[PDB]
Amino acid sequence: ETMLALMSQIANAHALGLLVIDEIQHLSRSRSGGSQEMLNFFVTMVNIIGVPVMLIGTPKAREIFEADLRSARRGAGFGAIFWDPIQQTQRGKPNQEWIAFTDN
DNA sequence: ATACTGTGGACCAGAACCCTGATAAATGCAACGCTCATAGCGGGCAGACG
């Protein structure tokens, strides 16, 4: 908590515009406190630090974040974009994205 | 009467406590490590349906 509160002063000294935390899939749920003290950390982090934050993970790492609105509303305070693999035939005709990517 | 014994008084120098400086040794405090309770995940092992 002391470092979480020290980060706010520094992030407000220089006008930080964004904060990206990448690869949350790599965290261990045994050295952190469980599946609840991670969510509490990631929800307290958004409130105190005034900058926008972005969280990136794998579909099996959403089980941490699906427990409550504290990241279903705070985390999805601006939506939740989903990445999918390319589909060959979305319509009756095959997708032009696949053809263009393969040709290039 | 006047010259000698005793004595009152003014008086210098050893000395004791205070001040100064430099070096060594005994504490006090801010910082760091030890210990105990509490919570939990995941793997390895006693009883299940097959």
Side-chain angles (χ1 to χ4, degrees):
Chain A
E1 187 79 32
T2 304
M3 281 166 308
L4 211 58
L6 267 164
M7 291 165 28
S8 312
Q9 309 172 2
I10 293 142
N12 295 280
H14 329 291
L16 207 72
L18 203 80
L19 175 58
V20 189
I21 314 178
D22 204 32
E23 277 137 10
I24 322 174
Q25 63 212 317
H26 284 178
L27 290 187
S28 60
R29 304 179 177 174
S30 165
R31 306 187 29 182
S32 296
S35 178
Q36 187 70 43
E37 209 172 289
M38 331 195 77
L39 182 45
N40 289 356
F41 178 84
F42 282 130
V43 174
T44 302
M45 177 174 216
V46 179
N47 295 339
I48 57 170
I49 310 174
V51 302
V53 303
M54 183 154 189
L55 300 174
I56 304 173
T58 190
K60 79 167 301 302
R62 79 186 319 174
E63 295 162 344
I64 294 175
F65 278 113
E66 282 292 327
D68 48 29
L69 287 89
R70 293 131 59 180
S71 193
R73 188 213 73 81
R74 277 174 192 81
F78 208 65
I81 309 146
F82 284 120
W83 281 96
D84 291 331
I86 316 167
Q87 304 277 30
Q88 191 191 2
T89 61
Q90 181 185 17
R91 286 298 154 269
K93 221 177 169 48
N95 264 27
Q96 293 300 112
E97 301 178 2
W98 175 249
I99 319 289
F101 180 74
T102 49
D103 273 18
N104 288 4

